[PDB]
Symmetry: D2
Amino acid sequence: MSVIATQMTYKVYMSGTVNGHYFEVEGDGKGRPYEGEQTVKLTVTKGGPLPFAWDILSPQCSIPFTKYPEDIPDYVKQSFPEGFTWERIMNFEDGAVCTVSNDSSIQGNCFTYHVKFSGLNFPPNGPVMQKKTQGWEPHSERLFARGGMLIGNNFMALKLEGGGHYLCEFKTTYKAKKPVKMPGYHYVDRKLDVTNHNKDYTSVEQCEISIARKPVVA
Amino acid sequence: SVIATQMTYKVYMSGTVNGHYFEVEGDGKGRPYEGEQTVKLTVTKGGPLPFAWDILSPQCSIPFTKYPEDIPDYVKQSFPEGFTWERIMNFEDGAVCTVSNDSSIQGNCFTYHVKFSGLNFPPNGPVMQKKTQGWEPHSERLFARGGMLIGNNFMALKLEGGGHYLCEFKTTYKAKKPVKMPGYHYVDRKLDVTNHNKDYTSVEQCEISIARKPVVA
Amino acid sequence: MSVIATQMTYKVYMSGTVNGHYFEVEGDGKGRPYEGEQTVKLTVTKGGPLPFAWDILSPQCSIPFTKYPEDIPDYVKQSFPEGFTWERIMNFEDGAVCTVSNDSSIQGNCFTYHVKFSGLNFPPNGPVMQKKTQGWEPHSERLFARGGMLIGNNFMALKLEGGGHYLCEFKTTYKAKKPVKMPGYHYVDRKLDVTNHNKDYTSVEQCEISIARKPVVA
Amino acid sequence: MSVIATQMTYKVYMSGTVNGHYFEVEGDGKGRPYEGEQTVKLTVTKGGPLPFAWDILSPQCSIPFTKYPEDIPDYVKQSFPEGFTWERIMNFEDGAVCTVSNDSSIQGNCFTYHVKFSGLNFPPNGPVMQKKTQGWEPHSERLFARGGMLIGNNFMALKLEGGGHYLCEFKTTYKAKKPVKMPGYHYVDRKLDVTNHNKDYTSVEQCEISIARKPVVA
Ligand SMILES: [Cl-]
Ligand SMILES: [Cl-]
Ligand SMILES: [Cl-]
Ligand SMILES: [Cl-]
Ligand SMILES: [Cl-]
Ligand SMILES: [Cl-]
Ligand SMILES: [Cl-]
Ligand SMILES: [Cl-]
């Protein structure tokens, strides 16, 4: 509030393994935390070119940049300056599973995100390992308070080259490092776009819009 | 077309919850194109039910969903041949239900035949102890696959004394003939039990359902 | 051996739906409860010829016929004459789910099983709806006590025409209708064999051997 | 086939995160690969004392040490000298999920295991974060061949302080780095015993017996 300015930058440090292939990624992002608008530029710094779809990593690259209306408590923004962690499970319909963890901290006008990524049982002839994916559909996260924590669930879908969808379910648990005022039951609508990349996706630029709201029919 | 701006319907439901057998009959009406409907349910066999009415309320009407013109309406197109649905419900304490529906049309009246099977509800959990207080408004992600419409919802039952009891629905809609398939979209709903008797052997509920594109797109 | 004779008969009544297809089945069985051997003959009395693999129904057609060594409490036999129920979830690797409930009672020398079967989301071109299955691999149930109940889990596999397996996970909860002495952590090994059938599986004969044991390596 | 000696040593290097908490572990093992007997000494080298049950790490600390009968192809031993990887998903009954990967290689008389562990959504008041677990029951893996890989499934159970079990399912995929002769459907029975440890589990000694077999009732 005082803590988070209307324009902020951030830094992403991600490392992990997909089917045992190790990688590191660094990003530089910026956006407007109260408008729910952000952009980031990512470089694969280790283990590139990645032999799997960039798309599984794009949503691990920024929760404080969500536009919350005044009458819904904003759990993440409240968690600063101490900050918060998040823990994500991703269950893909062909049996692949990822677990992703983030620590999020603030230094002046900059957030820092440390992300560990672990994914496996992606089928070798499936669309992640053959790189046949073409972006996530726009998605919606169901959010509710439980034991001091914010719990989110999304039905996600990757568009497939040649048509059709490849489904994934996200469960993300957000954990503020102090007690904050808990929101009621609500949603966050997002779209995540890859707006630029080089040929082997060792460089990527992404755009996201995130807006909290009440249920549409209530 | 086939579907009038005002329609009634009849629900015949039967099934078992933790092995306890029941039948329910219902009388509904609403406006298919406005996504508004109301039903009165009677437990006709196996009442009073020793579990929460709320697990049955979402099984009692897909034609009554307001579709905008630029989103094909899968279900309404399936008439007069009609359609079936197959639902799985996975509750967070391990309970699972499988529910199947057949929907048909006779003039001005739909008929829904519903078979419900739920089990592994913990004897001391909120369903068996009747501690649930209705569903949160919910949202269904819908997409097309192999001529079928596949829906998924994160549902939540409100609990007496506070907190939620979670359930994930997967519902697959199967038109009995080919129809024009819609793109990726959502349906928002609110289901409210507006009346009931002391033991929930008689229940009235009201549902609003509205289709839309993604909000942020 | 005062409630359960060394030779018993049984009657099965099963009804249910698969992908909305309604059916009924009746069976006459016989066996040696203490030897863990049994045979049953089944007839599809309503809804036949069934448009799906008989194999999804075969395991639902008799727990009292399991050979328990003397030093492992036999939850199911102890429940008699009052009897017991079971509740089963079946999760198939292509997304199909079944839920099955049984009530088991005893009248003299005969058990009666009432079974309600509900299965759905079987892909139209998958192995069940296309009848491509060729019996169940021999299987093992992991069994432990909790809350006065016996809880069982099995990794099951259907053999496929042309090679390969089609996987299914079972979870079965056994509920004695009176309190009984609870067994420790143990296993039941079974093999279910279809030994005869007519061309459309409207008549089926099955044999099952079931023997309880302690962990092999302990 | 004597790339693998009758007595062998190994080195384990494990790193990972549990609920965001980073750790590293090193171990020194020895055993008899043809007898399915092995023991290992573990040291938490970074991030100790760990704020969670050692027990969730103990099964990530040795597949070549399984006794195979001659008439069951031994997928893992055949993989050497090229070796193999494995990818494991653990689903705990209270919603916790871990993803574990291993690379296994051989140099002379010594195996080297590199293991990456990612666990999260352990409830703060659950038995893992409150350290209420007292070892794994002996367990049994169902194994079959698929697409040149070996697929395994176990129903596991941790014993609890005060009585009761805390359940976990393991799905493990073994991937040989060259083609090998594939086994039919079979099981491996194991017991994993922590035979010594210090007060905060920063040092641990473990013993494992593993033996493959055909189905007991077939
Ligand atoms: Cl895989
Ligand atoms: Cl709370
Ligand atoms: Cl239960
Ligand atoms: Cl389609
Ligand atoms: Cl289907
Ligand atoms: Cl007990
Ligand atoms: Cl948690
Ligand atoms: Cl193979």
